[PDB]
């Protein structure tokens, strides 16, 4: 499946099984653009989080209950959701994927 393939290729399952990961099917520039969209509170108390005006194409990858390194196994869920990112730096760009809504 896509999750197993992309998780491996992107070095999230080569040296562990990362329990959860989200992939966004939008251009890098359109995701970066989120950092000047709607400012929202972060879960951690900071306020450098931003929510996309638009829903975006995303794939959620979540480890199965039986999955165990090295034989990582994922469930793949596809959705169109608003994304929430934490932004930082100069340029002010996404550094953490927080949630999808």
């Amino acid at each position: 499946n896509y999750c197993n393939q992309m998780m491996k290729s992107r070095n999230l399952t080569k040296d562990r099984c990362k329990p959860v990961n989200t992939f966004v099917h939008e251009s890098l520039a359109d995701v970066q653009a989120v950092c000047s969209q709607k400012n929202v509170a972060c879960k951690n108390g900071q306020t450098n989080c931003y929510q996309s005006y638009s829903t975006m194409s995303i794939t959620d990858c979540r480890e199965t209950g039986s999955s165990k390194y090295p034989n990582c196994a994922y469930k793949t869920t596809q959705a169109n959701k608003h994304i929430i990112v934490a932004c930082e730096g100069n340029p002010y760009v996404p550094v953490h994927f927080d949630a999808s809504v």
């Binding site: 992107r10 999230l12 992939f23 890098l28 996404p94 953490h96």
Partner: peptide, 15 residues
């Protein structure tokens, strides 16, 4: 050495 912005792109972007 990968930056935080680099790590986000690798982990999350699949344009």
């Amino acid at each position: 050495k990968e930056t935080a912005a680099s790590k986000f792109e690798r982990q999350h972007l699949d344009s």
